[PDB]
Amino acid sequence: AVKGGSFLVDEITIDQVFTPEDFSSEHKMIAKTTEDFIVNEVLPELEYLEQHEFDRSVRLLKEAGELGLLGADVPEEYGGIGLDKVSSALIAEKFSRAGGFAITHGAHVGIGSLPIVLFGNEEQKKKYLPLLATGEKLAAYALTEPGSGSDALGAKTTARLNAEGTHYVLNGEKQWITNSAFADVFIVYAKIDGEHFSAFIVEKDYAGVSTSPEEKKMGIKCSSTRTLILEDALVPKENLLGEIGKGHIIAFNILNIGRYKLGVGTVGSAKRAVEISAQYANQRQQFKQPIARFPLIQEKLANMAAKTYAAESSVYRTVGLFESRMSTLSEEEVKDGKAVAASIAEYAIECSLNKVFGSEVLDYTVDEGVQIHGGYGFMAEYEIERMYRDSRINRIFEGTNEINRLIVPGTFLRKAMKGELPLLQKAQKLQEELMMMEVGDEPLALQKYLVNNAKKIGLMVAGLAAQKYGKALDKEQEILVNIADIVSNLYAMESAVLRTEKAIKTTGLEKNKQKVLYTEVFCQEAFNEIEAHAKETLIAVENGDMLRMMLSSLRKLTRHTPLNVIPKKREIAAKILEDERYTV
Amino acid sequence: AVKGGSFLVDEITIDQVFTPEDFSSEHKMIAKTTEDFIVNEVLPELEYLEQHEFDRSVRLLKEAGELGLLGADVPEEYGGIGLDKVSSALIAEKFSRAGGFAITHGAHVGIGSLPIVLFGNEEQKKKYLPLLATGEKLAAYALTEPGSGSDALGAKTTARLNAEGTHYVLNGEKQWITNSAFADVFIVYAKIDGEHFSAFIVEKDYAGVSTSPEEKKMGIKCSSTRTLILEDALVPKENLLGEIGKGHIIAFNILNIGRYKLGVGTVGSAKRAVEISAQYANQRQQFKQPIARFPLIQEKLANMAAKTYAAESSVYRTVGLFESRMSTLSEEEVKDGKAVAASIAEYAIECSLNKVFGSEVLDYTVDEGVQIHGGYGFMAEYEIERMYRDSRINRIFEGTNEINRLIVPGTFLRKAMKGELPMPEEVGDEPLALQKYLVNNAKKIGLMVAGLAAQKYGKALDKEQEILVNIADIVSNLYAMESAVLRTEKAIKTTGLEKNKQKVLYTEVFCQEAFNEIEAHAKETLIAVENGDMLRMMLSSLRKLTRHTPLNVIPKKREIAAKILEDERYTV
Numbered sequence A: 001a002v003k004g005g006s007f008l009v010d011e012i013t014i015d016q017v018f019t020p021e022d023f024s025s026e027h028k029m030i031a032k033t034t035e036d037f038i039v040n041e042v043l044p045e046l047e048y049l050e051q052h053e054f055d056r057s058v059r060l061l062k063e064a065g066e067l068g069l070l071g072a073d074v075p076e077e078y079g080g081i082g083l084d085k086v087s088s089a090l091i092a093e094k095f096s097r098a099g100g101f102a103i104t105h106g107a108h109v110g111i112g113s114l115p116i117v118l119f120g121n122e123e124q125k126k127k128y129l130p131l132l133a134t135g136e137k138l139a140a141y142a143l144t145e146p147g148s149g150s151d152a153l154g155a156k157t158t159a160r161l162n163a164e165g166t167h168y169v170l171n172g173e174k175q176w177i178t179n180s181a182f183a184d185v186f187i188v189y190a191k192i193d194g195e196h197f198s199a200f201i202v203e204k205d206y207a208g209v210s211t212s213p214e215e216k217k218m219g220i221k222c223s224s225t226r227t228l229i230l231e232d233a234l235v236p237k238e239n240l241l242g243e244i245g246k247g248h249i250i251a252f253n254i255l256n257i258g259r260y261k262l263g264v265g266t267v268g269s270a271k272r273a274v275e276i277s278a279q280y281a282n283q284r285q286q287f288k289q290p291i292a293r294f295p296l297i298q299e300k301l302a303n304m305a306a307k308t309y310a311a312e313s314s315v316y317r318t319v320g321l322f323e324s325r326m327s328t329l330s331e332e333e334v335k336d337g338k339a340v341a342a343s344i345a346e347y348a349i350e351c352s353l354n355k356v357f358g359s360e361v362l363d364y365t366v367d368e369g370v371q372i373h374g375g376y377g378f379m380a381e382y383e384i385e386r387m388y389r390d391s392r393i394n395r396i397f398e399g400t401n402e403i404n405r406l407i408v409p410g411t412f413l414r415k416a417m418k419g420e421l422p423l424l425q426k427a428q429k430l431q432e433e434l435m436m437m438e439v440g441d442e443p444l445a446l447q448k449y450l451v452n453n454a455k456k457i458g459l460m461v462a463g464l465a466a467q468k469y470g471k472a473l474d475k476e477q478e479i480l481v482n483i484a485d486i487v488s489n490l491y492a493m494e495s496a497v498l499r500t501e502k503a504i505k506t507t508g509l510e511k512n513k514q515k516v517l518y519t520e521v522f523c524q525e526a527f528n529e530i531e532a533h534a535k536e537t538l539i540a541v542e543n544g545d546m547l548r549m550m551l552s553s554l555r556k557l558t559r560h561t562p563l564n565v566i567p568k569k570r571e572i573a574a575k576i577l578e579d580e581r582y583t584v
Numbered sequence B: 001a002v003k004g005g006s007f008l009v010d011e012i013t014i015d016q017v018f019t020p021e022d023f024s025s026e027h028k029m030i031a032k033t034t035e036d037f038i039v040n041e042v043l044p045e046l047e048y049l050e051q052h053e054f055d056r057s058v059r060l061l062k063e064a065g066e067l068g069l070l071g072a073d074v075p076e077e078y079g080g081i082g083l084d085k086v087s088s089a090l091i092a093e094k095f096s097r098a099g100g101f102a103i104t105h106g107a108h109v110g111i112g113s114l115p116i117v118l119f120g121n122e123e124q125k126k127k128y129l130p131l132l133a134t135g136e137k138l139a140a141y142a143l144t145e146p147g148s149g150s151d152a153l154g155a156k157t158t159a160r161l162n163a164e165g166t167h168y169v170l171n172g173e174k175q176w177i178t179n180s181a182f183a184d185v186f187i188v189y190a191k192i193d194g195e196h197f198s199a200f201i202v203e204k205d206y207a208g209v210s211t212s213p214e215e216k217k218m219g220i221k222c223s224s225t226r227t228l229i230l231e232d233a234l235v236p237k238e239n240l241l242g243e244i245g246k247g248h249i250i251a252f253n254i255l256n257i258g259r260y261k262l263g264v265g266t267v268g269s270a271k272r273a274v275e276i277s278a279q280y281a282n283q284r285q286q287f288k289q290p291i292a293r294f295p296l297i298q299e300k301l302a303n304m305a306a307k308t309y310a311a312e313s314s315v316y317r318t319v320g321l322f323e324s325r326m327s328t329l330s331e332e333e334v335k336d337g338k339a340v341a342a343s344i345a346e347y348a349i350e351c352s353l354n355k356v357f358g359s360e361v362l363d364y365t366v367d368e369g370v371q372i373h374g375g376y377g378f379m380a381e382y383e384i385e386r387m388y389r390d391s392r393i394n395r396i397f398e399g400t401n402e403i404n405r406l407i408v409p410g411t412f413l414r415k416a417m418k419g420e421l422p423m424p425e426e427v428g429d430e431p432l433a434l435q436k437y438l439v440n441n442a443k444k445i446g447l448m449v450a451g452l453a454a455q456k457y458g459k460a461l462d463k464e465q466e467i468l469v470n471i472a473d474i475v476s477n478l479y480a481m482e483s484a485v486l487r488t489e490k491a492i493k494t495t496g497l498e499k500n501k502q503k504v505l506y507t508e509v510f511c512q513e514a515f516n517e518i519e520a521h522a523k524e525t526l527i528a529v530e531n532g533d534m535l536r537m538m539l540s541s542l543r544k545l546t547r548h549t550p551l552n553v554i555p556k557k558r559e560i561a562a563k564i565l566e567d568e569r570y571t572v
């Protein structure tokens, strides 16, 4: 299989990417089953959920449980239905239609249940999973505290073995715990003797466990969110999850999964925003025509759709990498779960990119969706108004986008140290080719060219910054974020290029016109951003004559014949408005 | 008086711009008075206003009225206090601290009262203004309908002079009418015989007038917003405002005022977002230190502050232009109102620039303020959470930002036809030399790009919306850059370089980023307009206009932030 982060340094091929065109009939059916559940059962109640009628959430969760939608990532031997990772991504994508209920569901099947799936011992799995898989029990994940959010290992909740040695005694408060109103089981992190950061399976019914009132939130109002209060909470010794003092291993692994899952979710929402905006544009008339006839409206729709194509392509690529790493695993390995966790941890970089890129694309799409609706976009009666409010938290969830950006360059450098990525050996090849100094004829020739040059620019800039600050590069946050933004744009560009290239080779040029258009337009603009990020970093890192050298090298890497995107965006929009949905 | 739009073609000097450093003691004292009222009287009740306790709104408005805060733009002759335009802008800036109540107050003093102030006859003014000016009566403005928002002249409300010829009979619905729960007077637009678009003074008690229940809104929840329902509404003939079929004159003139006033409001809000974000950054610790010590946090604050400086500078520049034309008028001209409307209409371009640029700067500041707060930014018990939701509608008010951008280039053309308008290594050492250079080249780039576009499309340029917006965006950035440059240049000439280090830093960082956007907008426009070798030549000319030695903005943003975090507020 393909190594994590290798896209930056190797010429990835259409055969090495998974795309939505690779979905089986099984994937498509599960997607339709979920969609029908959400549309037929959930949406008619959504307005009561937003009013915190949590009895309805619980009932709906258990109905979802009966359809196998809560147990897709749980193995059959523990009472799950054991679907592949593509299937459970598609389930999350379709759940996004239900606003904050997608958060409820995601916290149950993801951060809440997966710590037991991946790190539970045999006894813990046979006990908890059969019930979690059907929704008979519901789960929540309790890491954050008032004093510890981004710095999640700064938790102040303590755990101390009682005189009898039979139970841990937990004290503290966990903040903003999704599902708290109705969760039966909480994965709680606490420091044993105030020293050793550890995870615990904590039942709601254990002595000393309670919750605060609901938070008043901007959006995702139908998701339950409370503080978990632990006042000599009594947790059986055997409910320790993983090893004493190694709670960070669970938290870090769970985070990766949360990241890409949120990516998939934001992609579902961005598609829905495109759809309702396109339908609105066709019906709303001003100046005696559908506002759909206005180029500025068409332009907003095309930007929204092209970003969504790039997000959808890069997210399912990551899901595909996870699945092909999973392919290697025997049934004993999958059952244990340690190998499943490592199969995704391999792609921690791609997960963080998806999370930041997906949440920002959704941020842009709901914002233009509101603008397309005008004053109706500001009215609670309209679906886009709720989406606008729900979206804002995604840039904060699962690691703020700042933290997610800051960790990307260091992850690359750590992989270069451990010998997983030939970064030094590849950085020195480029130093020569630069002192050595057209495009091609195939469809996508120009975009393939920009993708290749983007890789070189990222490497050049990252190499130069590391050689300049050394081990103290960690303090230069503005630079780190430029590099992270370069890598993120590069990953989305390549994902879009390769997916379109694969489609062409699969179904022809004529049928893949919309993909080609999204690709040309997105690549041009994303490459423009890459160039600006590189310039800012070069200027911060060098000066005088040496800086003019580097800037000419960048100009050489960046020179091409720009496209006229204005008619292309009108062409993209025509098809979106024709289908009244995001289309590919 | 400097002509409207002349900033694009002429070299404006520090003497031809008004800045906050030009505020008089009276200006400052009116600002302080308003702020004391907001902080001491309004904010302790704001949570209840958000729950639609309008009884409190009404009482607070009448209390503002007793301090003269509702009659600043009303002549002394009609029972107001008759202050200058700078004073009334400052009142608006300070009202922004109270969220949706600034929209309540604004709708009363602005779109609600000004149509009578500006276009009322003597009898209309003498009857309505004394009561509006003190808040004994409250006003609202009703133009929008379900079928007509941006296309406001598409109103379907009809007016029919009754058989007796004493009353117009009005039928229709007006949508999203601010202050509806408690307004005594509504300025209503309707088409006489379904043809002649006209304005009317409509009292709440007139037969056939009612309102819907309150809208459920994303933000500014404490602002009342209902449908005005006219079912054979009986309006006296003498309540026709202006002339039959000439309602557009009123609506266009009122829009100009609404635009710059919202610009002013959004500047007050952006300053507040900077302040609360800097205070939060200093108090919140993660990884054993205040998040203020993290460069990424510093960079956010510094971007928020520099944008706010450019917005504050360009908005008060426009207010000064208005004030300068007002300076000329006799007491009698001011009284008749038409010349006051004319004095702002002249600067229609600058008003639209301010409205779009201010609303987008605030959109950025509240979004980064929420990000600085993390999860707390998404919780209703934090002020930034409410600001983030309040802000979203500003990009839609007073002309959507799309419409405000679309009318800019065509307005430059109309001012032209009407006769109101027609090397980087040399730059130097003097403060701001590069930034002055960039402002000048930005003007050239704007003119070059618009000129080439008009040549290609001619009169059919109005269909090329994407290119028109590119031009508008170049013009907006230019007006903001030049305003920040002249304000800073003015300050250096007045009080010295050392005392104005913060202003220099704002102008340097803002100008580099804004100029980079201008280049990108110019490039997109040239690529859409030419092709082949003529394109290569134009792109090569643009290269010449954009060439310069760029600054390292990263250390400068750290310096900006250090001063913001020390003062815990936006400072200049």
Ligand SMILES: Cc1cc2nc3c(=O)[nH]c(=O)nc-3n(C[C@H](O)[C@H](O)[C@H](O)COP(=O)(O)OP(=O)(O)OC[C@H]3O[C@@H](n4cnc5c(N)ncnc54)[C@H](O)[C@@H]3O)c2cc1C
Residues within 6 Å of the ligand: A107, A140, A141, A142, A143, A144, A148, A149, A150, A151, A175, A176, A177, A178, A179, A217, A225, A393, A396, A397, A398, A399, A400, A401, A402, A403, A477, B284, B285, B286, B287, B291, B294, B295, B296, B297, B371, B372, B373, B374, B375, B376, B378
């Ligand atoms: C509605 C909601 C539901 C939630 N549900 C759960 C849940 O079920 N389970 C759970 O465990 N958690 C949950 N959380 C917690 C959540 O994911 C945190 O909000 C988040 O992890 C960030 O923490 P913070 O809000 O304290 O922000 P902070 O960590 O205080 O960050 C504030 C700002 O400083 C920046 N910053 C922090 N560190 C650095 C640095 N070193 N360098 C540069 N900038 C930095 C951040 O990016 C941010 O912009 C929930 C939160 C919310 C809002």
Ligand SMILES: Cc1cc2nc3c(=O)[nH]c(=O)nc-3n(C[C@H](O)[C@H](O)[C@H](O)COP(=O)(O)OP(=O)(O)OC[C@H]3O[C@@H](n4cnc5c(N)ncnc54)[C@H](O)[C@@H]3O)c2cc1C
Residues within 6 Å of the ligand: A284, A286, A287, A291, A294, A295, A296, A297, A371, A372, A373, A374, A375, A376, A378, B107, B141, B142, B143, B144, B148, B149, B150, B151, B175, B176, B177, B178, B179, B217, B225, B393, B396, B397, B398, B399, B400, B401, B402, B403, B406, B465
């Ligand atoms: C909370 C609230 C309070 C309000 N209070 C008042 C009030 O007191 N008095 C009053 O008169 N009005 C009031 N309004 C009306 C408000 O200002 C309108 O929403 C605004 O003027 C736009 O109209 P619309 O919402 O119907 O959007 P639309 O006109 O339908 O616009 C929809 C979209 O199409 C775009 N568009 C429209 N035409 C074109 C075109 N020619 N080219 C390109 N794009 C175009 C717009 O930019 C927007 O993106 C209020 C509105 C709200 C939301």
